[PDB]
Amino acid sequence: MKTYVPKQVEPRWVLIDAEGKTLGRLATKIATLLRGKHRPDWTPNVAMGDFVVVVNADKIRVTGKKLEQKIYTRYSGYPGGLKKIPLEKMLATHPERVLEHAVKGMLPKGPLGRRLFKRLKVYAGPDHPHQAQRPEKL
Amino acid sequence: PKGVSVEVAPGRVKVKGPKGELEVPVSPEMRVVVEEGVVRVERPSDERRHKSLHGLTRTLIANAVKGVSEGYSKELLIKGIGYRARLVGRALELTVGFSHPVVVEPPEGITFEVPEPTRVRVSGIDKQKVGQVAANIRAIRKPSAYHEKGIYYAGEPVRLKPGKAGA
Amino acid sequence: MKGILGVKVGMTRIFRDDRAVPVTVILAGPCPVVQRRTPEKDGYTAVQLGFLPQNPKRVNRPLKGHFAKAGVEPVRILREIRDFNPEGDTVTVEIFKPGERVDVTGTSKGRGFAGVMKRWNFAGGPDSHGAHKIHRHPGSIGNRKTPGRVYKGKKMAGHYGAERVTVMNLEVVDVIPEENLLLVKGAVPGPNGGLVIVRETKKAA
Amino acid sequence: MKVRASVKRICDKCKVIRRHGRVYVICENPKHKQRQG
RNA sequence: CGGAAGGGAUAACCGCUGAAAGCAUCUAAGCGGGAAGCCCGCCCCAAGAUGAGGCCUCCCACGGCGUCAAGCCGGUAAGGAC
RNA sequence: GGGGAGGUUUGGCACCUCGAUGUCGGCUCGUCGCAUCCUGGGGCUGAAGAAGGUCCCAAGGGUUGGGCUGUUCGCCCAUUAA
RNA sequence: CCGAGCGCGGGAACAACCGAGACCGCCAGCUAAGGCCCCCAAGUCUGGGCUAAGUGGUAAAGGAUGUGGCGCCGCGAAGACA
């Protein structure tokens, strides 16, 4: 025969917690969902993996000293442009990042790996734009 | 712990006394309850962290009770020469080795009070934040300075030779 | 952190006090306030500020003759003071009093594409001994093989002119309501008869 | 002494207190103010 | 005229209540002081911040092929340009 | 007398390059490093004060101008918080 | 072993470390080395031990009341550590 090709599938939204979950353990799952890898109809080259909006990120938990320890680096092309912000302050200002980040490096990278990150919309809250389905999960 | 006023909560023993009430939040790990007329405390097991926390907390809250039962006896004995302690209105205006008068202000939770300029009295109704400000005055003017002069609690000064040992 | 809009004029030295003072004047004049701003539907706290009346047909359309109060448009249109809520009416000049220090913002005139000496400032060199081929030139830029890249932002041969700067800590000694002028310790940036906003200084608050 | 790799109890009236992360050796006369460093 | 003032977390270090280990401790729970250093305040860029954001106004259909599907074609209205 | 770290010096090796990798100092232009020379702070001192010594943290900013020598290194010079 | 196996898969990338001899096709099954949380294919399997350092994520003589576990010789209900 010849293995099957899902036609234009509908984009199923979801929603996951945040608060209480361990930062990394979360994405691990979350990731998989952004791609079709949970779906019994996954396909590499199409991105039909679930739009994961997330609620109250600001209360993400994580282990050890990572609160203080963990360092979020950023380097402009300008010599000496290396700016390293800690997980700590990173919670305090725009905490949503920390998730989106832990995440954004659990995808692959070719032009769609980033298309998929657009398929993700966390907030520190809860709240979101109640657009549709978004059936809660666990 | 007689006419006290304890109050167990998840992990915070709010205690009222004849003076005021304090809140002393410690880890729920072990066992916090009032029983029979006196408060108790007990570890979950024979474990490093557990053991330590058990002792720590037991005497923490133990003092907490005694604090609102009046545990104040801390006051500084300013030894020197031209070091005078005054108290005008709300502010203690002592004048020590510094070229200017030291402006101290009795804050929220404790009450100072200067008997005579030779020595400042502190009524402290909060065993924690008490030694803090004791140390505050004693570190506003460090004593013993080679021979003498400064701010002592009462601790005997270790000496050190005067106009000598400057080879 | 109040403010005012203004045009530039003068620079002199008025022998006030006893000594002398380089004095730059500005006309704040009838400079409108034509639209406030509020957090939820903005995010800050601000006011738009107009200027000099001569506007007939060449302007038209939205005007903000709408807005809520018309007042027509100047011709030098309007800008924005941040963190400022006025009393309402077209503010003038006497916003500040003779005895205050302030900050002043304006474009730097155009010196365009310039030589690195007259820019950030370099050196060039050898008028004689060495050669003639590198009088007004940068000489070096970066390291041999590693980097092998030319440092991003390495002070280079380029533009230096039509820009903009805010100056801090000046001293407005005079202010005439009768003709709408404001006289400061001469330091004004930009040419005479141009665009410049005055706002209060900063120091310890 | 005072800051060094090797840090003893030297005079009996000293104690080794693993404080703020690293080993110290404190006493009365801070001339033996040792420290693992 | 600019380096400020000041705020927030810190090093080395100095301290407070306090155990395991009746006594001790600046700590393993908690808390305070503390640097030209770190974050900011300050000046400037900057929504090509593909995520193009926000505010204030201003103009408005069927006109010929797409009936249902996104276009396509000729001048217009705010306008903008040569 | 032991143990290390560093990769500047001085050497051992001869793997890229012999159809080329133009070697010194100075000009110009730097940037990084910290085992800090100056400036904060702090510790201890055989530290009265003064100034000094030594050890830890700290690169933000600074690190001058003339004489001799091609000379970097050096000495001198008049200085500087350096 | 390469060279001649820069044909294959691990080894992050790497002629020679590990595994393993390519006549060709296959949208078929096992399995090696490594590996199974997601790269990237498969156990966030099973069960119990150690550690609090990001050790793991590459350094010594040496140093310390770090923490788990083992052993030895007194002290002690005649009464002790403090």
Curated annotation (Swiss-Prot), chain A:
Keywords: Ribonucleoprotein, Ribosomal protein. PROSITE patterns: RIBOSOMAL_L13. GO terms for cellular component: cytosolic large ribosomal subunit. GO terms for biological process: negative regulation of translation; translation. InterPro entries: Ribosomal_uL13, Ribosomal_uL13_bac-type, Ribosomal_uL13_CS, Ribosomal_uL13_sf. GO terms for molecular function: mRNA binding; structural constituent of ribosome. CDD domains: Ribosomal_L13. The keyword Transport does not apply. Pfam families: Ribosomal_L13 (PF00572). Part of the 50S ribosomal subunit. This protein is one of the early assembly proteins of the 50S ribosomal subunit, although it is not seen to bind rRNA by itself. It is important during the early stages of 50S assembly. Belongs to the universal ribosomal protein uL13 family. HAMAP family: Ribosomal_uL13. This is Large ribosomal subunit protein uL13. The lineage of its organism: Bacteria, Thermotogati, Deinococcota, Deinococci, Thermales.
UniProtKB/Swiss-Prot annotation, chain B:
The keyword rRNA-binding applies. Keywords: Ribonucleoprotein, Ribosomal protein, RNA-binding, rRNA-binding. GO terms for biological process: cytoplasmic translation. Belongs to the universal ribosomal protein uL6 family. Part of the 50S ribosomal subunit. NCBIfam families: L6_bact. This is Large ribosomal subunit protein uL6. It comes from Thermus thermophilus (strain ATCC BAA-163 / DSM 7039 / HB27). The lineage of its organism: Bacteria, Thermotogati, Deinococcota, Deinococci, Thermales.
Swiss-Prot record, chain C:
Part of the 50S ribosomal subunit. Forms a cluster with proteins L14 and L19. This is Large ribosomal subunit protein uL3. InterPro entries: Ribosomal_uL3, Ribosomal_uL3_bac/org-type, Ribosomal_uL3_CS, Transl_B-barrel_sf. Belongs to the universal ribosomal protein uL3 family. One of its GO terms (molecular function) is rRNA binding. Keywords: Ribonucleoprotein, Ribosomal protein, RNA-binding, rRNA-binding. One of its GO terms (cellular component) is cytosolic large ribosomal subunit. One of the primary rRNA binding proteins, it binds directly near the 3'-end of the 23S rRNA, where it nucleates assembly of the 50S subunit. One of its GO terms (biological process) is translation. It comes from Thermus thermophilus (strain ATCC BAA-163 / DSM 7039 / HB27). Gene3D superfamilies: 3.30.160.810, Translation factors.
Swiss-Prot record, chain D:
GO terms for biological process: translation. The keyword Ribonucleoprotein applies. Transmembrane segments: none annotated. Disulfide bonds: none annotated. One of its GO terms (molecular function) is structural constituent of ribosome. Coiled coil: none annotated. One of its GO terms (cellular component) is cytoplasm. InterPro entries: Ribosomal_bL36 (IPR000473), Ribosomal_bL36_sp (IPR035977). Keywords: Ribonucleoprotein, Ribosomal protein. Belongs to the bacterial ribosomal protein bL36 family. NCBIfam families: rpmJ_bact. This is Large ribosomal subunit protein bL36. The lineage of its organism: Bacteria, Thermotogati, Deinococcota, Deinococci, Thermales. The gene is rpmJ.
